[PDB]
Amino acid sequence: MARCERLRGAALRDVLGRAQGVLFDCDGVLWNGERAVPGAPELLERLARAGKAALFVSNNSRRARPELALRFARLGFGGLRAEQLFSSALCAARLLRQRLPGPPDAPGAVFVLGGEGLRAELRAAGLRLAGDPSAGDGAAPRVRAVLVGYDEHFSFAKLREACAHLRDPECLLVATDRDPWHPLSDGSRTPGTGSLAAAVETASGRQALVVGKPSPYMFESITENFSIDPARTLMVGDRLETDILFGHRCGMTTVLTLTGVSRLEEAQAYLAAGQHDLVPHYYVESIADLTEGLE
Numbered sequence: 001m002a003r004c005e006r007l008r009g010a011a012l013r014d015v016l017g018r019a020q021g022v023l024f025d026c027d028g029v030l031w032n033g034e035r036a037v038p039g040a041p042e043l044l045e046r047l048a049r050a051g052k053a054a055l056f057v058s059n060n061s062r063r064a065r066p067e068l069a070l071r072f073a074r075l076g077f078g079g080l081r082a083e084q085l086f087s088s089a090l091c092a093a094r095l096l097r098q099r100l101p102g103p104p105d106a107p108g109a110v111f112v113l114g115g116e117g118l119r120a121e122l123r124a125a126g127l128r129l130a131g132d133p134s135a136g137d138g139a140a141p142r143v144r145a146v147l148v149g150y151d152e153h154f155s156f157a158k159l160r161e162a163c164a165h166l167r168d169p170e171c172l173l174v175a176t177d178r179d180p181w182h183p184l185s186d187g188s189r190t191p192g193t194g195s196l197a198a199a200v201e202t203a204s205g206r207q208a209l210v211v212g213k214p215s216p217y218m219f220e221s222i223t224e225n226f227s228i229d230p231a232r233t234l235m236v237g238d239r240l241e242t243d244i245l246f247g248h249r250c251g252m253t254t255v256l257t258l259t260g261v262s263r264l265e266e267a268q269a270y271l272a273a274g275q276h277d278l279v280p281h282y283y284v285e286s287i288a289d290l291t292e293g294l295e
């Protein structure tokens with residue numbers, strides 16, 4: 001059970017040693033905006049050398065996987081497979097693929113609130129999108145899902161159209177994630193998908209199926225590919241309500257890093273109130289502190 005203990009010394013060598021793999025959130029963990037966390041690339045190197053699997057889990061739905069993978073090299077994390085990176089955009093496409101309720105002849109079109117990167121991910125999964133060029137000579141395909149992603153061009157009209165589609169109770173409502181906002185380099189903040197999801201949910205009177213963290217689906221999507229043991233896996237993140245909760249639901253050992261959104265103070269407060277799902281097992285100032293555990 002989570003005690004929010006600072007991970008160091010003997011315990012750190014025991015935890016890392018027994019760990020068969022590490023799942024990393026990206027923003028606020030590996031980097032902050034234009035700046036990599038010093039020692040983070042070295043940690044990933046040593047993990048590889050120690051035979052421990054590193055996987056990456058991001059709620060990003062703004063860039064498709066190939067472009068998202070570019071950030072790793074850009075910020076000094078070389079030698080990484082695209083297959084190591086899991087994003088809400090990627091997992092949302094796969095979930096729609098699995099769940100679109102249309103007949104095999106026409107599984108249904110997806111109405112997307114989001115950018116070109118997200119649309120690219122969806123098409124690559126073989127998904128038909130509303131707004132795409134119609135066949136012929138032919139009507140517009142029936143919309144069977146609304147997907148809410150990070151939409152920098154969100155609008156009242158798009159909100160209204162989303163509601164029109166959701167008038168059909170058989171139409172799915174899916175959101176890539178529920179992150180309410182994100183910190184920017186200048187200290188400001190940008191609205192998150194969670195804020196757009198709140199509007200669609202409220203206007204339509206429906207609850208969205210959430211793909212990304214802290215929903216366990218992305219982990220199930222990871223197990224789809226690799227065989228990993230949650231009991232032997234670390235989940236490292238900077239955001240309590242997203243990353244740590246995620247780790248708890250998946251049965252992973254959770255590590256909060258302090259280089260991101262959440263503060264030690266919040267973690268300790270949750271512990272006081274006895275909300276153990278939001279309490280990390282361990283914390284470190286930055287993931288650069290984990291490296292000594294590999295000796």
Ligand SMILES: [Mg+2]
Pocket residue numbers: 025026027028029237238239260
């Ligand atoms: Mg983060």
